[PDB]
Design a protein around this ligand. Structure first.
Ligand code: IHP
Lengths: 567, 90
């Protein structure tokens, strides 16, 4: 009976499993759609709001993603798109019971936030990840009105910081906060309102402060929330005083469930030790903002045996990474960011050896993002052989086209070893000197790769061809500054219907190829993004600044600015 | 019961035309159809989860194989749905 099938489905919540059940027969299709609780829309222009709402009438959680990843490198001009308002407007009428909206790289305005606050009485979760377009006034509308709000998470968003007064709009009757991430906000929130908020929210488990909360006020907040599981500090600087340090130490030690620490802006080495009571059970440490030196980092890391995720500046150095490799046997993810990315000569002793050390020492290491100035094929081969379980490998050599510094060869064979030996590698970002041969290796071996990012690499269209011809699992390809043009794109046009998207900027793709691709593939949006005026004002052979291609069931979008043309 | 605390698990019970003696025996000892008919929440959950585990990670074809459902989608219809599923909802 229908009621049993719906109950069987209640235990099936994976998107892919949902889609699979929807295709077994027409009856399962109907029962499935009427009880689907969440939708994940990885490209907001792949489908229209109306299509979503009419298929899945009883959705309570929506996740939407807008601009592609290279937006992070400012390669998507302002005004390109990713407007969420059309989605909020459509849902406002139909999804009365909506509880969660999670957005990434979307343009979200105060009008959006006001309409959310007003339309969705049961609204509980707002995650704005790398979004832009709104201000603390929109935030004030959410705080004033969303009586049931549990999560307000603004991670990496660009907010118009009009005033910190917004937070004082949460009323005295509001007690339901579970997660608050305001780390992106420059404006100072009322500290008294913040302390009152934390005090009255007994289920608060994640509190990620902004920089404007000074270190001398931190212990105060921690005393009010001893149940915290995640803490992002505010500022981490003060005059060095025994009373301040002792108050901080005690407050942190009273947080027995703390597992994740971040923030640390302007961190003073004298005050880092106050977190040591936490260290023993910490599983995530984000020291990205702390410009503290290797030895101080090492003293902290020495006593984090349970660490699973570390983000750290290259100040860790090869010596700090050797320590990490012996101490943190459960490490799963390491990200090492550049302290001085605009200086060509090394300012720290961080090289390929640091990454080699961690590859040898941490048997569960499977996700790497590593910025460095030098690399060898030998090191990459050692890494691949040591870690055949690697699933995400992103290596960012600061100098474009830097060869192996010992042999002066391209890094083709080293990355070749990565894709050959790491059979479940799903994400790869390439850098260093690379020829078409690395792409041949990728095509042959990277059969599980879903996301590939390429910059300043390859020799000819043959490189891009090997990737489109060979990479069976490819979902996202993004390319900048490579000698790839018309031939591989057009020869592999049908492959594009199997991918979320393809991005190519500062490559050799002609306007004429984009026009022809658009003609051939009507179910693709082929968007030429060019700030030099109408492309038909230059010869058809002239390369476009950018092209962004994506499959869609919605057809050409209605919100293109003047510098975007759909073919 | 014809096919106290044990009986009262069933909200229907709280003379059973729709349950067989063999299946009733199992219900007491503690199927999906009986658990639903007798409105016994926990037996429903156990049995419905077990069924869900027969579906998870399987293709549409494997599903109607383990069950015994025929594909009533026209090829046009099946392509339109699969396309929407993959392009929009994955
Ligand atoms: O499955 P996708 O839609 O391709 O999303 C991926 C995935 O993030 P999600 O948790 O939203 O699935 C990545 O997680 P990883 O496995 O690489 O760690 C994330 O990477 P980060 O961990 O760095 O967040 C990456 O985001 P990004 O491309 O910004 O690095 C993002 O891809 P999207 O760009 O499509 O969101």
């Amino acid at each position: 009976p229908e009621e049993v099938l719906e109950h069987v489905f209640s235990f099936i919540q994976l998107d892919k499993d949902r889609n699979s059940v929807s295709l077994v027969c027409k009856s399962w299709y109907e029962i499935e759609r009427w009880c689907r609780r969440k939708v994940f829309i990885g490209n907001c222009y792949a489908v229209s709001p109306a299509t979503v709402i009419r298929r899945f009438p009883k959705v309570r959680s929506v996740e939407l993603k807008g601009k592609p990843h290279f937006a992070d490198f400012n390669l998507v001009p302002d005004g390109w798109g990713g407007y969420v308002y059309p989605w909020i407007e459509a849902m406002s009428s139909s999804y009365t019971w909506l509880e969660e909206i999670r957005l990434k790289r979307m343009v979200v305005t105060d009008d959006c936030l006001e309409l959310i606050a007003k339309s969705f009485k049961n609204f509980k979760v707002l995650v704005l990840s790398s979004c832009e377009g709104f201000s603390t006034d929109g935030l004030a509308a959410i705080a004033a009105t969303c009586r049931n709000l549990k999560e307000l998470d603004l991670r990496e968003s660009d907010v118009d910081d009009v005033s910190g007064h917004w937070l004082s709009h949460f009323p005295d009757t509001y007690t339901s906060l579970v997660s608050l991430n305001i780390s992106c906000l420059a404006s100072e929130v009322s500290f008294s309102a913040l302390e009152r908020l934390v005090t009255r929210c007994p289920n608060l488990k994640s509190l990620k402060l902004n920089r404007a909360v000074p270190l001398e006020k931190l212990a105060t907040l921690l005393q009010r929330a001893p149940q915290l599981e995640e803490l992002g500090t505010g500022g981490y600087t003060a005059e060095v005083r025994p009373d301040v340090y002792s108050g901080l130490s005690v407050a942190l030690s009273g947080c027995k469930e703390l597992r994740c620490l971040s923030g640390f802006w302007d961190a003073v080495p004298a005050y880092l030790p106050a977190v040591y009571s936490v260290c023993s059970r910490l599983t995530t440490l984000n020291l990205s903002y702390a410009t503290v030196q290797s030895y101080d980092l090492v003293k902290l890391l020495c006593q984090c045996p349970k660490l699973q995720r570390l983000w750290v500046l290259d100040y860790i150095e090869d010596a700090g990474l050797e320590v990490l490799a012996s101490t943190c046997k459960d490490l799963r993810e390491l990200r090492v960011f550049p302290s001085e990315p605009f200086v060509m000569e090394p300012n720290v002793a961080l090289t390929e050896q640091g990454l080699v050390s961690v590859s040898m020492g941490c048997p569960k290491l499977e996700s790497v993002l590593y910025f460095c100035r030098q690399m060898t094929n030998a090191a990459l081969i050692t890494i691949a052989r040591n870690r055949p379980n690697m699933t995400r490998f992103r290596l960012c050599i600061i100098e474009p086209k830097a060869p192996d510094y010992l042999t002066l060869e391209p890094l083709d064979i080293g990355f070749g070893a990565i894709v050959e030996h790491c059979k479940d590698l799903r994400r790869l970002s390439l850098s260093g000197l690379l020829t078409d041969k690395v792409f041949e290796y990728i095509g042959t071996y990277a059969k599980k790769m879903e996301m590939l990012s390429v910059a300043f690499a390859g020799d000819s269209d043959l490189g891009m061809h090997h990737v489109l011809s060979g990479c069976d699992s490819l979902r996202k390809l993004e390319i900048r500054d490579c000698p790839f043009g018309d031939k591989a794109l057009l020869a592999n046009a049908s492959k594009l219907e199997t991918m979320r998207s393809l991005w190519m900027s500062s490559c050799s793709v002609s306007f004429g190829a984009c026009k022809l691709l658009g003609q051939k593939m009507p179910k693709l949006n082929v968007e030429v993004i060019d700030e030099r005026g109408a492309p038909d004002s230059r010869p058809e052979s002239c390369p476009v600044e950018r092209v962004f291609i994506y499959r869609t069931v919605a057809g050409p979008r209605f919100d293109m600015p003047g510098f975007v043309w759909n073919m | 019961l014809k096919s106290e605390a044990v009986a009262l698990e069933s909200q229907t019970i709280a003379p059973l035309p729709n349950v067989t003696s063999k299946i009733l025996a199992k219900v007491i000892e503690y199927l999906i159809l009986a658990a639903n008919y007798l409105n016994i929440k926990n037996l429903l959950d156990l049995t419905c989860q077990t069924v869900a585990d027969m579906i998870k990670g399987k293709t549409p074809e494997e599903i109607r194989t383990t069950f015994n459902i025929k594909n009533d989608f026209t090829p046009e219809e099946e392509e339109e749905v699969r396309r929407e599923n993959q392009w929009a909802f994955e």
